[PDB]
Amino acid sequence: DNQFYSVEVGDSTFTVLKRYQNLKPIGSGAQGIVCAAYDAVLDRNVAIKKLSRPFQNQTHAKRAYRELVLMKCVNHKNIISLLNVFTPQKTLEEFQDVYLVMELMDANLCQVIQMELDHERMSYLLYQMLCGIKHLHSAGIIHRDLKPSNIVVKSDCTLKILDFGLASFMMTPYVVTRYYRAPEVILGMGYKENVDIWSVGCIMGEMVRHKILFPGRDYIDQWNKVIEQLGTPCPEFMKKLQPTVRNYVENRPKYAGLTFPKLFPDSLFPADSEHNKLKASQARDLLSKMLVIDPAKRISVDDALQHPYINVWYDPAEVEAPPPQQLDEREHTIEEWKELIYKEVMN
Numbered sequence: 130d131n132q133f134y135s136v137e138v139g140d141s142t143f144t145v146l147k148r149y150q151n152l153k154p155i156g157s158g159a160q161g162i163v164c165a166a167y168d169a170v171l172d173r174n175v176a177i178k179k180l181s182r183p184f185q186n187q188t189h190a191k192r193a194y195r196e197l198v199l200m201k202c203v204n205h206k207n208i209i210s211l212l213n214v215f216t217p218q219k220t221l222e223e224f225q226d227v228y229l230v231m232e233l234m235d236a237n238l239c240q241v242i243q244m245e246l247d248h249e250r251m252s253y254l255l256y257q258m259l260c261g262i263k264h265l266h267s268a269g270i271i272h273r274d275l276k277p278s279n280i281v282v283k284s285d286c287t288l289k290i291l292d293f294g295l296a297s298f299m300m301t302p303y304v305v306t307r308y309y310r311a312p313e314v315i316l317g318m319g320y321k322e323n324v325d326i327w328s329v330g331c332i333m334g335e336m337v338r339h340k341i342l343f344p345g346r347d348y349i350d351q352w353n354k355v356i357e358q359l360g361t362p363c364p365e366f367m368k369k370l371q372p373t374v375r376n377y378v379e380n381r382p383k384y385a386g387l388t389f390p391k392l393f394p395d396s397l398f399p400a401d402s403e404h405n406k407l408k409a410s411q412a413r414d415l416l417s418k419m420l421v422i423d424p425a426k427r428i429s430v431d432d433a434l435q436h437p438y439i440n441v442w443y444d445p446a447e448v449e450a451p452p453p454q455q456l457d458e459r460e461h462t463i464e465e466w467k468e469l470i471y472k473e474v475m476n
């Protein structure tokens with residue numbers, strides 16, 4: 130009595146439990162391919178993500194295992210919830226693919242970016258974003274890899290962050306995105322919680338300009354786009370850079386960097402009225418507090434959530450609450466990773 134059936138979607142095959150019906154493509158990325166589907170058991174729509182051979186490389190396998198262990202433990206209204214996990218393969222020897230069933234959303238942030246939002250929507254999206262980051266932080270997790278493709282939303286303006294971020298060489302088709310990586314994390318500097326504020330900043334700025342703030346072919350080219358617009362960091366900051374780095378950085382063409390009002394003119398914001406003009410200045414202020422090269426001066430999540438522009442949706446229940454009560458860290462080989470993932474999936 131088999132409980133699986135296969136269907137073609139995109140240029141790949143999905144083999145799932147019969148409960149999942151009428152699958153339909155909805156995008157793809159690095160971690161894998163995703164589908165939309167109706168779940169007859171729960172009588173609702175779900176998102177089904179297929180991880181093909183997650184154990185193929187160390188990093189890829191650590192990501193899968195981690196996301197899998199944390200997706201069952203944490204449970205915040207802004208973190209994507211895992212509904213079910215399964216593999217069609219029935220023995221460790223044959224074990225190949227893993228399927229994650231999650232709540233279905235209507236679009237990722239890349240799409241939202243392509244459009245304009247009113248101050249009310251934009252601030253709400255940002256509120257939920259920072260709120261999710263605060264929950265992760267209080268659980269000892271610091272993302273460090275927040276980007277628009279990792280965030281999804283629904284029509285009712287609800288938002289959820291997908292993966293849990295970062296914890297070897299790679300040549301796979303997976304892009305080398307790093308446009309959203311904080312400066313300190315780039316120049317090998319150490320980092321802290323507020324390292325995520327920089328990403329939110331890049332994302333917020335991108336939702337306003339509708340363009341990647343810092344387009345960089347390579348981590349070297351990116352640093353330029355950063356300095357050009359934001360200007361060169363203060364000497365003190367440099368004193369904090371490693372010799373090998375402070376050298377390259379301090380010998381890099383200096384820059385004044387365009388002011389914030391210029392970087393985010395009133396034309397990118399609704400200037401309908403005084404209320405909107407006032408809201409546009411408060412957004413600009415928030416951006417100038419998050420897009421700070423030197424983290425020492427960059428605002429924190431708790432402060433960002435109190436910012437006038439965001440404060441509007443504050444709620445002491447969704448912010449200050451008791452976070453969740455197996456955390457690996459040892460490197461393993463492909464084979465060990467495959468059994469670890471398999472045992473996890475099989476429980």
Ligand SMILES: O=C1c2ccccc2-c2n[nH]c3cccc1c23
Pocket residue numbers: 155156157163176178209231232233234235236237281291
């Ligand atoms: O990539 C998407 C995605 C992309 C566009 C629209 C909805 C979703 C969506 N809804 N739930 C999940 C769970 C994981 C990934 C994704 C989703």
